């Protein structure tokens, strides 16, 4: 206010000045006084490290620290805060504080999991910046100290869990990257960095965890640096899963952005070594269950994981490639199947899907070249069969479509 | 027969003379479903103002809950209905309707004599991992659990059972944890924790297997700061039915001290610290360490000022106590200790130092009253500690010492008439 304004006439000392405030006699509390404010600008106006001194004759300097930083939380307190939290780490530098000591000092030791919400956190980065660019042949990375202090799992969660707040996003991804570097320098194998992440634990909810992504990032540099010793990394998993359960997870992480592409990928690994094995199509059907006849599979992920494998299958064997409905009549059969896709238009899940393969059937038959009474006979039809039950639809619709083609009929 | 009365406060539009048509023709609720086009609706069948009006049209006609799931139930699939139905409760529109049928579907799994594994996987459990309570259809399998447990007491299955063969212990707790603090489930959650210490209890795991699983080897000095340390403390409690010797087995004993002393300041894990530094204190007198070992061993013995904040000092005064009211006659003080480990100039300089710092003043200023308070009833004189303060003539009056002399003459001075003696 106009205290300086009398303090700068008359010539009062700094010292007087802080005494006149009774600012010797504040607390931990001290930088929400006002009077902290224009004492510090007296101070200003006759520097930085004289507050900072007389500051320090009152608080031990690990509590000034904490003071310091909650300091610039205060938007009043912005300004003072920073200038002293500079001059306290010009200080450590030069008093060459090692950045362990200063870890001690901010009593981040008993900041466990919890460091990165820490408040005085940026306190100790800043001030291991400044003591490597001071001393750059003793010089430490704040990573190696993470590093020192975590496991690998653990460290990596603190960082995946801390770039989603953005006052600190940018630094932990930064370090994210360092950590995968890190493991590629220590010369761990792919096995081991998976291992340490943990990926053992998870079962078949594997492409569910986000650290999956954080190994396959490591194979693929890891492949690229070492490669007489890279690896397949469909392998490991096909080491560990079921060729089922591998199934269902690689065609449900084949419908997720993130891991749509490495799915795409594995999936197409797992139909080439089930081609190389020498499984066909209807090996692969029955593998994956789909010869059971829950009418629940017209519209399952079984299915498409199937139709993929199909699909590479038929670009082997040219000639003799398979089709859908020829398997769900080779399984199932006619009549069978015409009961299951007749059922199927019954339910809104399945009824698309039904209804295009229904038509599939009867082209089937058309170009089979089957006749009116030859489909009655091999549905079971009888005369007092009801025109309601699913076959005697079936063969209605039958002849409607064969009636809707008699040009075809030609085959 | 729930189902009349949310008809009464519900909105038609029109609607209710098709009804009333219907009532007056006779037609059947099948046909009457014809007539609606209700067949061809597919997912989005509840927001459809045409199924409401089916619905109270049974209503008119009948448990009229049970016809309309099973026209529905051919229709739709198990697990889409089931999805559907659940979605239809979180709309407020449609909410009586979505509950019931949520009730009849159920039943209808019971008769029907479905496994709770089954009903799991159709209400996609399954592929929900960690976040199993959060699922807002959690609450439905565990209505359909109870249900088919009294209706097949022989074949009957704990849910809990279900949990702990699909998640390990760790991971299951840190779940069940988590899921008490939201209070939409807080109940079945902590009953659930509780099974959780009985399944390893007749599973008859160690409480070093308990310990090991919980994660707790690599939690340092920050053991008790785990809550999970808690429930593996309650799981040797209901074992027995020591402590201590494992954690002294496992930790130095000045670590363990200044760990409990602070564990006495947090809720949760109080009162079981105060026991344990009780039995730390009682094997501390049991093999005969005196105060000042004890002081030796907790580091108390230098003239550290950090030590004047230290939850070592309180360790301290805590076996002081305990010593005191054993070995009585030969009774220690801290003032005592303290004038002896550091020495009297020590001391002196020691709590004027902590007598700057906010950090440190109360308990420096209040051991300084004490020291001048001690140094009175020896009868020291002025010149005395001027003496063993080792002061000059030419010493600067704001060194330490030279104003802890000032200080004691002070305090000499209010306090004559009791210097009497």
Same mark, same amino acid.
């Given at each position: ?186 010369? !761990? ?18 492409? !569910? ?44 992480? !084949? ?157």
């Amino acid at each position: 206010s106009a205290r300086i304004n009398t303090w700068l006439v008359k010539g009062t000392s700094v010292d007087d000045a802080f005494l006149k405030l009774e600012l010797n006699t504040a607390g931990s509390r001290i930088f929400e006084n006002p009077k902290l404010l224009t004492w510090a600008v007296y101070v200003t106006k006759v520097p930085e490290e004289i507050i900072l001194a007389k500051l320090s004759k009152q608080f031990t300097e690990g509590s000034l620290a904490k003071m310091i930083a909650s300091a610039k939380l205060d938007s009043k307190t912005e300004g003072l805060a920073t200038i002293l939290q500079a001059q306290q780490r010009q200080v450590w530098v030069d008093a060459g504080k090692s950045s362990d000591e200063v870890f001690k000092l901010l009593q981040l030791d008993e900041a466990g999991t919890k460091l990165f919400k820490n408040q005085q956190f940026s306190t100790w980065t800043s001030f291991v910046d400044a003591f490597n660019r001071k001393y750059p042949e003793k010089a430490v990375s704040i990573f190696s100290k993470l590093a020192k202090t975590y496991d690998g799992f653990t460290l990596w969660k603190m960082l995946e869990a801390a770039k989603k707040v953005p006052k600190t996003e940018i630094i932990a991804s930064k370090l994210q990257a360092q950590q995968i570097d890190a493991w590629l320098d220590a010369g !761990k194998s792919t096995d081991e960095v998976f291992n340490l992440l943990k990926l053992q634990r998870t079962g078949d909810k594997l492409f !569910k965890n986000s650290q999956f992504l954080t190994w396959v990032s490591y194979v693929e540099k890891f492949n690229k640096k070492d490669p007489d010793q890279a690896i397949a990394i469909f392998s490991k998993l096909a080491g560990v899963y079921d060729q089922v359960t591998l199934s269902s997870m690689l065609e449900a992480a !084949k419908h997720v952005p993130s891991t749509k592409r490495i799915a795409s990928y594995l999936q197409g690994q797992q139909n080439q070594h089930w081609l190389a094995d020498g499984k066909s199509t209807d090996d692969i059907f029955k593998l994956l269950k789909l010869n059971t006849p829950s009418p629940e599979n017209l519209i399952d992920p079984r299915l498409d994981a199937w139709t993929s494998f199909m699909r590479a299958f038929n670009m082997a064997n040219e000639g003799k490639e398979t089709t859908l409905i020829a398997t769900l009549t080779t399984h199932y059969k006619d009549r069978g199947l015409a009961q299951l896709l007749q059922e199927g238009t019954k339910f809104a899940s399945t009824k698309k899907i039904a209804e295009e393969l229904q038509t599939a059937q009867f082209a089937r038959w058309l170009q089979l070249g089957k006749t009116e009474d030859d489909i009655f006979a091999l549905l079971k039809l009888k005369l007092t069969t009801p025109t309601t039950d699913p076959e005697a639809i079936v063969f209605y619709q039958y002849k409607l479509f064969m009636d809707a083609h008699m040009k075809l009929a030609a085959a």
